[PDB]
């Protein structure tokens, strides 16, 4: 019983122009993730965590090396995101004119299909906002905003879920709730979840880690 990977990043590197010189934002990173895993990318600030996440999310192309989402072969990056990836951004990134439920429904819209209101409400209930489908963004607390962000990432039934330090603006109790929710939907929906964090109080909710140091990645079980 050895599942195929959902995401394979082999010797990927991101080199940026840094003024007149260059900076190697990411150096031959190799990660691989399978359904139902929460892999935490850890490491001091400036070691390439968010860069690994952005190439894993097809937001950036690597300058050398490969990022493969098995089941998206033949798609360009935007469509790969639109059809297979969910984005739990660090900022909740909710659209002000839309209601909470509409934050979920619009991802159905841009995916080409008639928005499914019942699924939207079920997913808002699932992340702990049962019945708040009509709340405007100004009425949601930062915790609730983040929960909406997660439900939005679930709306399209993605195979890959990328969480970029989604508890950075939350206290201890809300951070624990949010990381528990992330692990719980990772296991329930069999997502492959890449989660960037700097708080060690969170590593207990991971199955394994990628230690980052100076753009170098090492896959660790402890």
């Amino acid at each position: 019983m050895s599942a195929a990977p959902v995401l394979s990043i082999t010797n990927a590197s991101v080199v940026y122009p840094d003024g007149i010189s260059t900076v190697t934002a990411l150096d031959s990173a190799n990660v691989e993730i399978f359904p139902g895993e929460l892999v935490a990318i850890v490491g001091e600030s400036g070691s390439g965590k968010s860069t690994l996440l952005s190439i894993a999310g097809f937001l950036q192309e690597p300058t050398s090396g490969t990022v493969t989402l098995h089941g998206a072969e033949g798609l360009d990056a935007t469509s790969t995101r639109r059809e297979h990836i969910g984005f739990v951004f660090q900022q909740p990134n909710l659209l002000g004119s839309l209601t909470a439920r509409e934050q979920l429904l619009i991802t159905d819209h841009l995916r080409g299909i008639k928005p499914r209101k019942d699924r939207a409400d079920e997913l808002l209930a699932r992340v702990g906002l049962k019945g708040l489908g009509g709340r405007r963004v100004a009425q949601l607390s930062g915790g609730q905003r983040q929960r909406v962000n997660i439900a939005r990432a679930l709306m399209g039934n993605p195979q890959l879920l990328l969480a970029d330090e989604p508890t950075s603006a939350l206290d201890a109790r809300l951070s624990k709730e949010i990381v528990e929710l992330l692990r719980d939907v990772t296991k329930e929906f069999a997502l492959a979840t890449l989660m960037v964090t700097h708080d060690r109080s969170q590593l207990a909710y991971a199955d394994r880690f990628v230690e980052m140091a100076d753009g170098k990645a090492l896959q660790t079980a402890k």
Partner: protein
């Protein structure tokens, strides 16, 4: 078109103000052509250009303010075609509302005023200017949102 209509709803004040402006200027042109039928035609042309410039200004400011919502949508996976259709449909709906209200109330006022000053109201005299200013503003709106397809989705990754 989803987000465009929702934007219209949520920020009804600014959109109603700009629709009133464009409808007022379309009504001005309606009455000016109705009284026309060199100087008059020159005034009509320059006022068409004024309406176009007003549309361009408002829409560049609106798009520049929408930048981060557009960035989030691009990151999630919205296509260029999709974002462009949304922006242009928002603009077209607002300009249609403007030109329609202006032309209707202007035709009404012309039917009411045809007795004191020689007024010629036809259907071309009202539709030609309506669709004309509509297309004026739509060309200008294309000019304005030219760089909606440009926004870098990694903007969404920041703070």
């Amino acid at each position: 078109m989803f987000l465009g209509i929702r934007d219209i709803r949520a920020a009804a004040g600014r959109f109603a103000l700009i629709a009133s402006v464009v409808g007022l200027i379309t009504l001005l042109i309606v009455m000016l052509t109705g009284l026309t039928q060199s100087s008059l035609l020159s005034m009509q042309a320059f006022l068409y250009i004024i309406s176009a410039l007003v549309t361009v200004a408002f829409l560049t400011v609106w798009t520049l303010q929408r930048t981060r919502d557009i960035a989030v949508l691009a990151a999630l996976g919205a296509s260029k075609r999709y974002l462009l259709i949304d922006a242009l449909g928002q603009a077209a709906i607002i300009l249609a509302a403007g030109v329609a209200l202006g032309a209707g109330i202007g035709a009404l006022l012309g039917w009411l005023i045809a007795g004191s000053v020689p007024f010629s109201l036809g259907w071309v005299s009202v539709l030609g200017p309506a669709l004309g200013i509509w297309l004026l503003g739509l060309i200008g709106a294309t000019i304005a949102v030219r760089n909606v397809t440009k926004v870098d989705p990694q903007i969404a990754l920041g703070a």
